[PDB]
Scaffold this active site. Structure first.
Site, mmCIF file in Angstrom:
data_model
loop_
_atom_site.group_PDB
_atom_site.id
_atom_site.type_symbol
_atom_site.label_atom_id
_atom_site.label_comp_id
_atom_site.label_asym_id
_atom_site.label_seq_id
_atom_site.Cartn_x
_atom_site.Cartn_y
_atom_site.Cartn_z
ATOM 1 N N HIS A 1 0.222 -4.684 5.835
ATOM 2 C CA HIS A 1 -0.011 -4.904 7.259
ATOM 3 C C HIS A 1 -1.431 -5.454 7.544
ATOM 4 O O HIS A 1 -1.762 -5.659 8.708
ATOM 5 C CB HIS A 1 0.337 -3.668 8.122
ATOM 6 C CG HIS A 1 -0.619 -2.519 8.002
ATOM 7 N ND1 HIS A 1 -0.278 -1.366 7.304
ATOM 8 C CD2 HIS A 1 -1.848 -2.354 8.543
ATOM 9 C CE1 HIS A 1 -1.327 -0.565 7.406
ATOM 10 N NE2 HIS A 1 -2.292 -1.111 8.151
ATOM 11 N N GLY B 1 -8.565 1.742 10.785
ATOM 12 C CA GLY B 1 -9.367 1.156 9.724
ATOM 13 C C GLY B 1 -9.344 1.985 8.442
ATOM 14 O O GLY B 1 -9.869 1.535 7.420
ATOM 15 N N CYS C 1 -6.624 2.776 6.712
ATOM 16 C CA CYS C 1 -5.561 2.187 5.882
ATOM 17 C C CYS C 1 -6.151 1.570 4.638
ATOM 18 O O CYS C 1 -7.170 0.886 4.715
ATOM 19 C CB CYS C 1 -4.768 1.151 6.673
ATOM 20 S SG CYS C 1 -4.164 1.739 8.269
HETATM 21 N N1 LIG Z 1 -0.373 5.127 15.539
HETATM 22 C C1 LIG Z 1 -0.973 4.421 14.871
HETATM 23 C C2 LIG Z 1 -1.691 3.492 13.980
HETATM 24 O O1 LIG Z 1 -3.123 3.641 13.965
HETATM 25 C C3 LIG Z 1 -3.690 4.339 12.926
HETATM 26 C C4 LIG Z 1 -4.128 5.648 13.067
HETATM 27 C C5 LIG Z 1 -4.490 6.368 11.938
HETATM 28 C C6 LIG Z 1 -4.399 5.796 10.688
HETATM 29 C C7 LIG Z 1 -4.015 4.473 10.550
HETATM 30 C C8 LIG Z 1 -3.701 3.706 11.675
HETATM 31 C C9 LIG Z 1 -3.613 2.227 11.444
HETATM 32 O O2 LIG Z 1 -4.635 1.549 11.369
HETATM 33 N N2 LIG Z 1 -2.393 1.693 11.340
HETATM 34 C C10 LIG Z 1 -2.189 0.263 11.426
HETATM 35 C C11 LIG Z 1 -0.745 -0.112 11.400
HETATM 36 C C12 LIG Z 1 0.151 0.375 10.433
HETATM 37 N N3 LIG Z 1 1.389 -0.093 10.517
HETATM 38 S S1 LIG Z 1 1.500 -1.149 11.806
HETATM 39 C C13 LIG Z 1 -0.119 -0.979 12.246
#
Ligand SMILES: N#CCOc1ccccc1C(=O)NCc1cnsc1
Ligand SMILES: N#CCOc1ccccc1C(=O)NCc1cnsc1
Lengths: 304, 304
Positions: free
Chosen positions: B41, B143, B145
């Protein structure tokens, strides 16, 4: 989201851990520049532990008696000295992995990460706090002496603790990197009972703000209190008195969440007077006190 | 003495963390040999997150579109590929700090250490467990991830997890280092509810043995039970069924403490049916389930 008991990355401190042997005793040492720091009880035998005169014991030891091993290679000891309860072993090589560092003596309530070592090798990392009775609730076995507590500010490692002993009650005692023990502990096998282990009130409040930020809000109430009122309640429950300094330190958490510090105090007051009633806060069934207002702000903002 | 939620020393994993940027998205990557591993992603924009076709999105990306930065120096991307939900960025330089490593897909109930990173820089280390519903109760912000979960066996790092997302309920989902998600999670902003978060019974038993070893014995009772009887009690309380395999795994803890596994089960049974009555076990007011029988044996013996 999510709140965890988080330790600092230990890499910078791993690069400093060495093994120190004196006679038959083997413990850990901290190598920074051309100096290896270790507990002075490395010079003691099991017969000396009861009542040692470290100055007398040290007369029998020479530079060649302290065997310093960094990894699998031997370090040459070109000098030795005693500073309070630590030994400073001047080696001929500066540690090439020496990070930027400081030696700081912390106050009770402050938290730090411990890198637990055996025979100079790191085995685990966990988060600790200097208890108000100057003990630490660590996880340390025989041979763990020499393992250090620390904080990191981007690239600078502030060494705050060095492990020395376990009290008969299973808690831990140690020094700062100048060899001065936290509290009244002495490095000898004698009767040393710890004082009252009071709860760090400013840290419980910080942890309640970390829970509000992360979605745990069931404990928020319709009440408020004064500093004097809350402190009468805190005295009863063996909680540290909350000062105006602690209120100011909780300022950015109060600001971010929009919950006044005295309102969070009245939430803490009700939780103390009524318990949790089988409920949990941040996946914990008791009021956590080992996260400072700074640790909450760091973990919740992502300071690297 | 003392029992702590201990993470592995993170140094070996810190040496692998890099920053990966694709367009405007920036997340973490894991650099092992000449390959940088990161969540797929990274190629998505906030508009793609709802329903992305990663194969189509990837056609628009070339080697020069992925900006890999190890520390403050730029790494050259000479190739890129998608394996399940991760991207493998072939760089022109092998990571000189690559430790000995393996990629392992762990089972639920197994524990690992997470090195939380932001912009390729490590910010904290904590201990986790793969929940029985294939989620992890981490501490991760935007961030984060790309941050990885791991276990260490002396010098070999077994990478088991890579962080990918946070479910709407605040828990975390991620993959193994082959890009396969743990559980049924998909890397898209869609309705994904977690299953029942049952308690890891074998880990609660292991943690009860760690408490007996460390002096906490108030909960030991005069009773015993059978595996079938205990499992009826465990079903009621949303505890994992205990198998003969789990009994054998608890063998060395049962041996060291002299308390038969089924006797410890009857202690667990009474604690479930009667609660803790305001008491604590290892300084915790709830039954801890994130220490494996192996973690107890390691922490209590001092494996480096
Ligand atoms: N709800 C939500 C997503 O936000 C986060 C919170 C905590 C850890 C990671 C993310 C993150 O950066 N995910 C990005 C993402 C993963 N798959 S589609 C966009
Ligand atoms: N009780 C007790 C001592 O045993 C330990 C347990 C845990 C951590 C350290 C030690 C340790 O090695 N102390 C050595 C010592 C310190 N001062 S006189 C001898």
């Amino acid at each position: 989201s999510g709140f965890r008991k988080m330790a600092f990355p230990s890499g910078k401190v791993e690069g400093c851990m060495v093994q120190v042997t004196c006679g038959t005793t083997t413990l850990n040492g901290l190598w920074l520049d051309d100096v290896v720091y270790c507990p002075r009880h490395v010079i003691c035998t099991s017969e000396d532990m009861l009542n040692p005169n470290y100055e007398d014991l040290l007369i029998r030891k020479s530079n060649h008696n302290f065997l310093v091993q960094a990894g699998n290679v031997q370090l040459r000891v070109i000098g030795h000295s005693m500073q309070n309860c630590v030994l400073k072993l001047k080696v001929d090589t500066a540690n090439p992995k020496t990070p930027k560092y400081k030696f700081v003596r912390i106050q009770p309530g402050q938290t730090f990460s411990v890198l637990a070592c055996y025979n100079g090798s790191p085995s685990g990392v966990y988060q600790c706090a200097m208890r108000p009775n100057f003990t630490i609730k660590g996880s340390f076995l025989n041979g763990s002496c020499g393992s250090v507590g620390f904080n990191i500010d981007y690239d600078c490692v502030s060494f705050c603790y060095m492990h020395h002993m376990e009290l008969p009650t299973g808690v831990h005692a140690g020094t700062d990197l100048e060899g001065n023990f936290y509290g009244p502990f002495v490095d000898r096998q004698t009767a040393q009972a710890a004082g009252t282990d009071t709860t760090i009130t400013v840290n419980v409040l910080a942890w309640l703000y970390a829970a509000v930020i992360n979605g745990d809000r069931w404990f928020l109430n319709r009440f408020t209190t004064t500093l004097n009122d809350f402190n009468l309640v805190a005295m009863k429950y063996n909680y540290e008195p909350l000062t105006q300094d602690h209120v100011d330190i909780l300022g950015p958490l109060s600001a971010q969440t929009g919950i006044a510090v005295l309102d969070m105090c009245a939430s803490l007051k009700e939780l103390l007077q009524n318990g949790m009633n089988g409920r949990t806060i941040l996946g914990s069934a008791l009021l956590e006190d080992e996260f400072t207002p700074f640790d909450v702000v760091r973990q919740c903002s992502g300071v690297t």
